[PDB]
Amino acid sequence: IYIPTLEEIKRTLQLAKDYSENVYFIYRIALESGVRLSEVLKVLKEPERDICGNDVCYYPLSWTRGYKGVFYVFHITPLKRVEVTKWAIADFERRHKDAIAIKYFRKFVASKMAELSVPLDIIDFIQGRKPARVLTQHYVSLFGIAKEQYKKYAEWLKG
Numbered sequence: 001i002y003i004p005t006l007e008e009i010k011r012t013l014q015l016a017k018d019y020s021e022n023v024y025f026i027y028r029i030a031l032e033s034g035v036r037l038s039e040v041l042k043v044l045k046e047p048e049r050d051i052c053g054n055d056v057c058y059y060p061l062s063w064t065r066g067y068k069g070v071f072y073v074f075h076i077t078p079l080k081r082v083e084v085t086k087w088a089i090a091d092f093e094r095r096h097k098d099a100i101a102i103k104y105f106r107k108f109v110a111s112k113m114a115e116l117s118v119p120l121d122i123i124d125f126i127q128g129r130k131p132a133r134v135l136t137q138h139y140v141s142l143f144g145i146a147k148e149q150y151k152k153y154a155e156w157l158k159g
Helices: 006-019 021-033 037-045 086-095 102-115 120-126 137-158
Strands: 057-063 069-075
Touching: 006 021, 006 086, 006 102, 021 037, 021 069, 021 086, 021 102, 037 057, 037 069, 069 120, 069 137, 102 120, 102 137, 120 137
Parallel strands: none
Antiparallel strands: 057 069
């Protein structure tokens, strides 16, 4: 298993910014949140629903696949509307052969969150791998527990 280095992540962000401010921003929210590309595209299609606090922002997404559940896209940068072709990202990735593929940004987030002692199953929850079934104790508790761990990562991003 390979994991991107901070410098590969930064290089990619800088290339992304040159290519397009919107592609940069997709990458950036991928880096803040550790969610899948398709979930980042959903939150940026409708930034209205984003909730921000003193330290940290969150965007609830439903998940109705097998059971009905909820998870959150955590981040630190206020959202803005972004809609780009599906092809722009792929295009970006293809021209810069030193650019980290966006899907491997999650692996950087997990790795870094582990280094900051976020428990593995909160990492999974934060990343949207195991959404909380609605109206269960997990639903009651997980958001608040996740938010508190996410602050360690927010703190690190703010550098």
